[PDB]
C-alpha cells in the first residue's frame, strides 16, 4: 500500500548561486521541522544521508568570467554533488527516491548530472516562477542560480562559452525531456531558447486558463508521455505564491497556491517514478518569523506530497480493537 | 423574498475540548463584531439567546478515564447543551434557524444531540479539516474537541468505551447521514472507521479535482437528496485556510478559500433546509490582534451566507423616490 | 508585436470622494515603483504626462448638499479632470493608452466623462467590490467615490438632484454600456438600479460559478460584443482580495485574486481597444510597511498586464550570438 517503502535525504547548503546570504540555512530549516517524524508516521524508512559540502572559493580564486560570479566555485561544486548523487542512485538501483533540500538552484546542475549518470533516459519537471536556463552571456545578473539548465541541455551548447574547468560538465538532456510549470518571469532570451528548441511549459497564465489538472497531465504527456521515465522533480519554492513561500530570494506575486504546488507533486508521486526531488531556495534568513514558519511548512507539505502522503487519509498498519484490552464497549453493554 | 425571516443566536464557551485557553471568548468575538447589526440590515430578526455555562470541574472531580482529558466535564456539559438546544429547537418547531458560535468543537455531541431530539430524521455536513471522529482508545491527544462525532455514530459503538456518566448520550446518527467537506488532517483510525462504515467524504484532494460546486452538490446528494431533512451545519473555522482563518489552535495549511467556504454556506442555506448552524474553534487569543481580526471577519462573512446573505445583493424594502421629498432631478429640470 | 508601443501616465490625486486622508499619494506610489522600468523593458515608449491638480475647497465654500460631502469640489474637481482627459485622447485620436493612477475612485466621473468626449462609443468596465453606482439621496455614508457613475448614466437622471454646478457633468453612459466584475458589496438601492436597469453585472458569486475565463467573455460580449468598442477599464484596487491589496480604504474580504485580475486585464489588453485604464483607491497611508508594498506589487503588475505585458514571456529584440563577440562556444570547442 506504499509506493515508497522507504527514501534518502540530502542537504545542499548551495549559497554561491545568487547574492542574499541564508540558502545554506535551507537543509537545517527542514531537519528541525517535523518532517521526519511525520514521514515515519505514514510508514516510509527515511536516511539522512548527511549533507554535500559546497565548494566556496575566495573572491581571488574566482573572479568573473563571462561575466558569471563565482562560476569556479560552481563547477567545482557541481562535479561534487554530482558525484554524491551518482553513488546515492546506484546504490539504490519499489525504487528509492533521492529527497534533496538546497540551497539556491544552482545546485540542480551538479544533482540532474548526477542522476542522469544513475539514469539516463530520465525527463525533468521544472517547477519555478523562473526559467533557469539563461546563457552566461544573456544572464544581466551573472548569477549561478539563473543558469543551471542552459549548461545541461544538448541543444543550447552553441550559446556556452567553453571554459576548461566546466568540461566535466557534460550536456545530458535534450530539450524534448524537460517540461516547466509554474513560470512567469521569464527573461527575453529565455523565452527565446525555449520556444526555438520547443521545451514543454507551461505559465500560471496555463494554469489560468487550463487548471493545474489538466497542466499537470500536459506536461506529464509531453516528456513522459507512457511513465517509462524516471522523474527529477525540481522544485523551486519559489513557484509557490509569496504569501505562502515568503522566505526566499526572488518572490514572484501570483504564483501557484499551496494546494496547486501539492497536486503537481501528488500525480508525480503517483507516477511510481519519482526518482529525485529537489526543494530550491529557501532562505530562512528572510522575511519575519512567521513567514519562516509558513515557507518552512509549505515546503514539509510539498515534499510529504512527494514522498506518497495523501490528504485524503492512510488506513492504520494495525486496526485497533476495544476488547483485545479487556474493556466493555457500549454497544457491549447495552446487550 | 427571505427564506428565513428569523433567527435565533446562542454562544457556548467550551474549552475543556482542548488545550488552548480562548475557545470560551468566541461568542464574544462575534457579538462584538457587527454580525448582528448586518444581519439586522438584511431583514432578518436575530435574537440572542444568551450563553451555555459549560461544567468546568476540576483535576480532582474528573481524572483520565480511557486516556480522555475532562471526560465528566465533557458528558455533563454535553447534557446541558443538548437540553437547551431541544428546547430552542422545539419552540421553533419559514422555520427559525439557529446559529450557534463556540467554543471549541467538543460542543457539537452536545448541539446534535439536542437538535436530533427535535428533528430525528437530520443529516450533518461537517466541514472541517479533521475528521473529529476519533474514538477514545485510538485517539493519541485525549483530547474532546477530536472526538465528538464517535460518540454520536451507531456504527461506531462497539469501539466506545461504555462509561455511567454517558448512558444519556445516546447514538442518534447513521454513518449514512453524515457528510464531510474540506478534510486535510484525518488520523489513521478516523480514515478507517470512514471508509469501513461509508460515511460521505470529500476531501481537500477532492476540492481540488472535483471543484467546490460539484463537491457541495454531491455531499447534498449523499446525504440530503431530496431536501427532506433539517440540516444541521457544523462549520470548524479551522476548514478555511490559515491565510484567512489564523486564530484558531489547529491549523492546517492547504484549506478552503474563503470564497469556498462561502459557497457551501450560501448552497446550504438556499435549500430552505438549514436548521443548526455552529461555528467552532475560534481562538480570539491566538495569533495578532490583525489574525483575529481576519478571523473574526471570516466567521461574520460565513454566517452572514448561513443566513442567507447575498453576495450578488439585496433588493430595498422601500424604493426611495426623489420628488416624494419636494426635490427637483436633472432630468426634471432639463424637461 | 506590440498592440500598444506608447502609452500615456496621469496622476489624479483626488481624496475628496472619502474620508481617509492618503488616496493623494497614490500617483506617487506608482511612481516610485518599477513600473516606468519594467513597461520600458518590454518596448513599450511611457509618457509621464504629470498630475491633475484636483479641486479642494474649504468646509466654508464647500457645504452638504443633498448629503453629498464636497460636492462642489466634486463638480470642478470632475471638470477640470475631463478636460484634460479629453485633450490627451485628443491629441492621441496602434492606439496609445492612457494609464491613469488615482486617487479615491470619484475621479471616475471625470476621466470618463472627458473620455467620452474623445470617444462617444466607449464602453466601460468596472472592476470593483462596490458598485459607486448610488445616487445622492440613497447613499449612506455620502462620500462621492460611491458615486461617480450615477452622474452619467442617462438612466439613473430622474434621481439625480439638480445642481447648477452639475451641469456641464452630462450624462453620457446608457446603461447596456456598463458591465462590472468583482462585486461583493452593494448597496440595496444600487442592486435595484442595476437590475431595473439591466446593467451587465457579474459579482463574486458569479466568478466562483462561472469561473474568471467566462466571466470575462461574457462581460465583453455584453458590452463590446465585436469588439467594435473603444474600453474604459476603470480598476478598484479594493477589487482584489485584501490579502493582496490591504492598503486601500473600503477593504472587503472574498476578492479576486492577483491571478483573476490579471486575467482580466491581459483579455482587456489583448482586444485591442484598451483606450483608457484607471487604477482608483491605493492608499499607501493604510496598513504596515509591508501592506504598502504588497499593494503597490499588485498594482504594478496589474497595469504592466493593462499595457500588454505576458506571464508566458516576450522574445528579445535583438537575439544575441555568442560568435559575434570572438567568443569560442563548448560545441565549437568539442569540433
Ligand atoms: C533567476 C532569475 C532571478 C533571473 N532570471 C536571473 O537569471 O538572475
Ligand atoms: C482534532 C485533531 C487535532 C486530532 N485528530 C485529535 O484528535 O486530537
Ligand atoms: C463606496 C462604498 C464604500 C459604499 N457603497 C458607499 O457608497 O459609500
Ligand atoms: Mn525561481
Ligand atoms: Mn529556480
Ligand atoms: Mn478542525
Ligand atoms: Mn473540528
Ligand atoms: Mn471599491
Ligand atoms: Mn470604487
Given at each position: 500500500?506504499?509506493?515508497?517503502?522507504?527514501?534518502?535525504?540530502?542537504?545542499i547548503p548551495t549559497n554561491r548561486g545568487q547574492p542574499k546570504?541564508?540558502t545554506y540555512?535551507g537543509?537545517?530549516?527542514?531537519?528541525?521541522?517535523?518532517?521526519?517524524?511525520?514521514?515515519?508516521?505514514?510508514?516510509?524508512?527515511?536516511?539522512?544521508?548527511?549533507?554535500?559540502?559546497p565548494?566556496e572559493?575566495?573572491?581571488?580564486?574566482?573572479?568573473?568570467?563571462?561575466?558569471m560570479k563565482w562560476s569556479?566555485s560552481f563547477?567545482?561544486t557541481t562535479?561534487?554533488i554530482?558525484?554524491?548523487?551518482?553513488?546515492?542512485?546506484?546504490?539504490?538501483?519499489?525504487?528509492?527516491?533521492?529527497?534533496?533540500?538546497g540551497g539556491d538552484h544552482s545546485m540542480a546542475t551538479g544533482?540532474?548530472?548526477?542522476?542522469?549518470?544513475?539514469?539516463?533516459?530520465?525527463?525533468?519537471?521544472?517547477?519555478?516562477?523562473?526559467?533557469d536556463?539563461?546563457?552566461?552571456?544573456?544572464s544581466?545578473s551573472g548569477n549561478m542560480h539563473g543558469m543551471p539548465?542552459?549548461?545541461?541541455?544538448?541543444?543550447?551548447?552553441?550559446?556556452?562559452?567553453?571554459?576548461?574547468?566546466?568540461?566535466?560538465?557534460?550536456?545530458?538532456?535534450?530539450?524534448?525531456?524537460?517540461?516547466?510549470?509554474?513560470?512567469?518571469?521569464?527573461?527575453?532570451?529565455?523565452?527565446?531558447?525555449?520556444?526555438?528548441?520547443?521545451?514543454?511549459?507551461?505559465?500560471?497564465?496555463?494554469?489560468?486558463?487550463?487548471?493545474?489538472?489538466?497542466?499537470?497531465?500536459?506536461?506529464?504527456?509531453?516528456?513522459?508521455?507512457?511513465?517509462?521515465?524516471?522523474?527529477?522533480?525540481?522544485?523551486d519554492?519559489?513557484?509557490?505564491?509569496?504569501?505562502?513561500?515568503?522566505?526566499?530570494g526572488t518572490?514572484?506575486?501570483?504564483?501557484?497556491?499551496?494546494?496547486?504546488?501539492?497536486?503537481?507533486?501528488?500525480?508525480?508521486?503517483?507516477?511510481?517514478?519519482?526518482?529525485?526531488?529537489?526543494?530550491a531556495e529557501?532562505n530562512?534568513?528572510?522575511?519575519?518569523?512567521?513567514?519562516?514558519?509558513?515557507?518552512?511548512?509549505?515546503?514539509?507539505?510539498?515534499?510529504?506530497?512527494?514522498?506518497?502522503?495523501?490528504?485524503?487519509?492512510?488506513?492504520?498498519?494495525?486496526?485497533?480493537?476495544?476488547?483485545?484490552?479487556?474493556?466493555?464497549?457500549?454497544?457491549?453493554?447495552?446487550?
Amino acid at each position: 500500500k506504499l509506493l515508497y517503502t522507504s527514501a534518502n535525504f540530502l542537504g545542499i547548503p548551495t549559497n554561491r548561486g545568487q547574492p542574499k546570504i541564508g540558502t545554506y540555512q535551507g537543509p537545517e530549516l527542514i531537519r528541525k521541522s517535523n518532517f521526519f517524524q511525520l514521514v515515519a508516521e505514514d510508514g516510509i524508512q527515511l536516511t539522512d544521508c548527511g549533507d554535500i559540502i559546497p565548494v566556496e572559493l575566495n573572491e581571488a580564486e574566482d573572479p568573473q568570467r563571462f561575466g558569471m560570479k563565482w562560476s569556479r566555485s560552481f563547477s567545482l561544486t557541481t562535479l561534487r554533488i554530482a558525484e554524491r548523487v551518482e553513488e546515492l542512485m546506484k546504490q539504490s538501483n519499489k525504487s528509492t527516491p533521492l529527497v534533496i533540500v538546497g540551497g539556491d538552484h544552482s545546485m540542480a546542475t551538479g544533482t540532474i548530472l548526477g542522476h542522469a549518470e544513475a539514469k539516463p533516459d530520465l525527463c525533468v519537471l521544472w517547477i519555478d516562477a523562473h526559467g533557469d536556463i539563461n546563457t552566461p552571456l544573456n544572464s544581466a545578473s551573472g548569477n549561478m542560480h539563473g543558469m543551471p539548465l542552459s549548461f545541461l541541455v544538448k541543444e543550447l551548447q552553441d550559446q556556452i562559452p567553453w571554459l576548461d574547468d566546466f568540461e566535466g560538465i557534460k550536456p545530458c538532456l535534450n530539450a524534448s525531456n524537460i517540461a516547466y510549470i509554474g513560470l512567469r518571469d521569464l527573461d527575453a532570451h529565455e523565452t527565446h531558447d525555449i520556444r526555438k528548441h520547443g521545451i514543454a511549459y507551461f505559465t500560471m497564465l496555463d494554469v489560468d486558463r487550463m487548471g493545474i489538472e489538466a497542466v499537470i497531465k500536459e506536461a506529464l504527456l509531453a516528456v513522459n508521455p507512457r511513465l517509462e521515465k524516471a522523474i527529477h522533480l525540481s522544485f523551486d519554492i519559489d513557484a509557490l505564491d509569496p504569501l505562502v513561500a515568503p522566505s526566499t530570494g526572488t518572490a514572484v506575486p501570483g504564483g501557484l497556491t499551496l494546494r496547486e504546488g501539492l497536486r503537481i507533486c501528488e500525480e508525480v508521486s503517483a507516477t511510481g517514478k519519482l526518482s529525485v526531488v529537489e526543494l530550491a531556495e529557501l532562505n530562512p534568513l528572510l522575511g519575519s518569523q512567521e513567514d519562516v514558519l509558513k515557507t518552512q511548512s509549505s515546503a514539509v507539505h510539498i515534499l510529504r506530497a512527494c514522498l506518497g502522503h495523501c490528504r485524503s487519509g492512510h488506513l492504520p498498519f494495525k486496526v485497533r480493537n476495544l476488547t483485545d484490552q479487556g474493556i466493555m464497549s457500549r454497544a457491549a453493554h447495552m446487550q
